[PDB]
């Protein structure tokens, strides 16, 4: 059965917050109508949708994405009159004479993608001799910083960084609007954290940088199985995401007794799991070598006296 849906930037029918313990968890193939606040939309571009309870939880997930705002561009114009743009909706901008778009065009159409614009709208200047842009955590293969139209330049990133096309070495060509692709050094991003039932996590992004950290939380009478904090790295998220389940089903880590070691270290321990404590060489045990996680408690750990 599916627990209480934490709708993000939105709500379910508002009696369900009061009558939570009556209605939830819901049965599979039951449907539920949810909606976005103003300035937000569901991924289809609708203000309201039905989600459905499934073996996968609530599907599609009750997530409302923020509308893209009108861009701050110069040397050009925006054809569209509106201030805010729906997710999956598109918008037109164009250049003054002597300028070309971010896509190198006279005019460009951009889409507000699943989060953010498909390109940054800007009208730049015809680069007779393009200028190589700044390249933090990387190097160009030459001392040159200015190049003619149809000249090319190649660059390489530092240890643990990737080029704008996701390689570690990359080449670009000067054209009458700038470079054929823009040089940059970048890091791999961790995948979107899906909405959980019965709780939430506070720092929300479409994807996360290496060194981004996320904290999880639960609503009352539900508890977060697994870690309080999770971190992103270029290899991905380290732990599995924690879950707001019932009861506790989790114990804090034991001490290691003086003169001793354990059969399995762990990030977290759960009900029915054993930590087994072994004395060091030339030491002898007193108390149980076994301790077990039980109702969030442990049995008292052993002692290791000199042999």
């Amino acid at each position: 059965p599916c627990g209480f849906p934490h709708v993000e930037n939105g709500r379910i029918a508002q009696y369900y917050y009061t009558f939570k313990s009556f209605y939830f968890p819901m049965s599979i193939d039951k449907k539920l109508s949810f909606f976005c606040l103003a300035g937000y939309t569901t991924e289809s571009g609708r203000q309201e949708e039905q989600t459905t309870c499934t073996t996968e939880g609530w599907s599609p997930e009750p997530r409302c994405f923020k509308k893209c705002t009108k861009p701050d561009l110069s040397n050009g114009y925006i054809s569209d009159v509106k201030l805010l743009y729906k997710i999956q909706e598109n918008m037109r901008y164009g250049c003054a004479s002597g300028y070309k778009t971010t896509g190198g065009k006279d005019e460009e159409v951009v889409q507000c993608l699943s989060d953010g614009w498909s390109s940054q709208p800007t009208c730049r200047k015809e680069h007779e001799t393009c200028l190589a842009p700044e390249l933090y955590n990387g190097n160009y293969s030459t001392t040159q910083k200015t190049f003619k139209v149809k000249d090319k330049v190649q660059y390489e990133c530092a240890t643990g960084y990737y080029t704008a096309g996701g390689k570690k070495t990359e080449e670009v060509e000067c054209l009458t609007y700038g470079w054929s692709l823009t040089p940059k050094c970048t890091k791999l991003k961790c995948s979107s954290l899906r909405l959980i039932e019965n709780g939430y996590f506070h720092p929300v992004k479409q994807t996360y940088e290496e060194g981004d950290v996320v904290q999880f939380f639960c609503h009352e009478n539900y508890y977060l199985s697994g870690s309080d904090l999770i971190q992103c790295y270029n290899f991905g998220w380290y732990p599995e995401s924690p879950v707001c389940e019932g009861r506790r089903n989790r114990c804090p880590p034991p001490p290691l007794p003086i003169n001793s070691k354990i059969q399995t270290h762990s990030t977290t321990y759960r009900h029915g799991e054993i930590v087994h404590i072994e004395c060091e060489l030339n030491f002898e045990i007193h108390g149980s070598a076994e301790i077990r996680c039980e109702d969030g408690k442990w049995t008292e750990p052993p002692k290791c006296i000199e042999g």
Binding site: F35, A38, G39, Q47, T69, Y77, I78, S79, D80, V81, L83, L84, S97
Partner: protein, 722 residues
Amino acid sequence: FGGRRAVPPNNSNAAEDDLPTVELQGVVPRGVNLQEFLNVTSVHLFKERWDTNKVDHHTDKYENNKLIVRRGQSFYVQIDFSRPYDPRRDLFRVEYVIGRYPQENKGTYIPVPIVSELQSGKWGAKIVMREDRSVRLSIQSSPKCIVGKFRMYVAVWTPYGVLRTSRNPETDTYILFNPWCEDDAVYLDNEKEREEYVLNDIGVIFYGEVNDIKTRSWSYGQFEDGILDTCLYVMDRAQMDLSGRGNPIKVSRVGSAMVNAKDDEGVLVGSWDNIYAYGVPPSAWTGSVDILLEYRSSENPVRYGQCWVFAGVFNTFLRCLGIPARIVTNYFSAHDNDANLQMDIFLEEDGNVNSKLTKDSVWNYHCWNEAWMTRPDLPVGFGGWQAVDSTPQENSDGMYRCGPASVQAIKHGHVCFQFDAPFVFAEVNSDLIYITAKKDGTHVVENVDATHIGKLIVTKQIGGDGMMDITDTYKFQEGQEEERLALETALMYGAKKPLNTEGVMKSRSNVDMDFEVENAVLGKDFKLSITFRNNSHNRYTITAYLSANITFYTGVPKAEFKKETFDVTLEPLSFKKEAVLIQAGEYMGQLLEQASLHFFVTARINETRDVLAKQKSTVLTIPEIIIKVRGTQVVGSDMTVTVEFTNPLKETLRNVWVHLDGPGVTRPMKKMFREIRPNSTVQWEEVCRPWVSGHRKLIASMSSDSLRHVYGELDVQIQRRP
């Protein structure tokens, strides 16, 4: 028999019943010595206007000799008995009673217990002193008490039942709403705002158009003799249940519905017909006072009213009962919107205005009330000012008044809450749409203007007569994201946009157009100047049209008094200016009341097909009435008032009525002049005996068979009597 109800509805304060002077309990013996029990010989209410009861309740202004108090706050009385009261042996209570069918659980029979201390929020009486045969009480009313004129009785308990005072009309007590008491739903925490929005009896109404804001005074006169009884009579004529009159929401919801008369029910017959046969023209009234007294004395709808007249009369009603209230004027109001956030203008293919299809109109200004109250029927944070438009509009329940709609709900677009919020939101947040009605019958959206509707919203400033801009209390700064969030929230909850403005975009040409109309005195020629400016390296040819219309202030046109066409060529980066002279002889034969003119300038750019379109209004200036005073300005002394008026036209004015007013200085007076020759002046003089001290105002108005909506005023300091 009568099976609908166990007792008839208690819905008239004018109605009474005869409570027994003795109620017997058990088998009462022959010849009981009832004189051993207390008997009431007199009751004192300390009701004099200089005394603590009226002074501490802020009810000393009313021209009424009975006791008037505000609910939820204590007041003194004294009872004199046949012998000293003896708590060991004497049970008695005060009773407050209202209507013909009073019941205790309905709050309309109120027994006041004698108590040791007054409990917070409860009816109770504390004995503060005893001396000889007299008991002095401090009485507290409940802060949720019914508002109206209560009968009062004193009742003594005995082993043989109840002995009670006979009907004594000297003791009847008005209980009103209490802005000063923290527990009242109408509580207002600021002293200067209570002074203005409750205790001030002279208003200012803002009219004209937003570039030339005109002003006039209005006598609310809520303290004048018989106005409070007339406000009770309005609720009795509504047949409003007395148990409901404790609620400021329902008093506002019902009282506003009584102001506009549909049929022979209600205070004012609405008319905008410019003729006003068999009644008084809506632009002639100086105040609410003579309207309400004409209603109370004739028992029939007064002829005639318009939006600011309804707002003035409803403001008197609210301030009289003690709900804090003000008029607000919205400039460029999208009235009769039916919750649509779009007003349509139709154009011919050549870009001229199609007058045949253009039947929506934007009012140059519109007036409604705000009433201050908490909203226990809504979620947290929607208290404070409630918009109530007493003018009828097509609504969720047919054609009716709108509100109380929370102003705080309107600003944020939370139009899911009651009452009528989508219709009030659309007055201030609609857009203009310009549509080419092509000859093939198709409609193409050429241009959109989201900036025109509700361009300013104003009210009288606290303690002075300048305008206070309150536009930001109704909507966020225009073009910012918070205006978009408010709009999107309104669209979630039943505000409407019939036409999708997605097939409309910035002009291809990058040509700007704007025009200025100079302000003018009525009967003078004036200049209108149109400018076109090119922001491009292209060369354009433009055909442009001016249509000038005489309109009522509701924007309804009567005649197109001037029409002109211009052909303009703009060179690269250049501009051009066209000057148009409008002559007095083009408009002077044809003006409506309030002397309002409306101009459309529209054009089509030949090389890009783009349409340029703008519209503006002017109101012609009319000279004020001159008021003068002679003799001593002292309360109770005779003072001489001179009202002078000079005809501004080139015609003889006929059946001219001049009106004079000023609450506490003079009753409503009026004077009839058979004719006034073209350049001539008239004088009227009265002797008036002012009865209120401090700063006061005289107010005058003029009307006739042709000219009307002409005003004047004078501030008079009146000295206190010796």
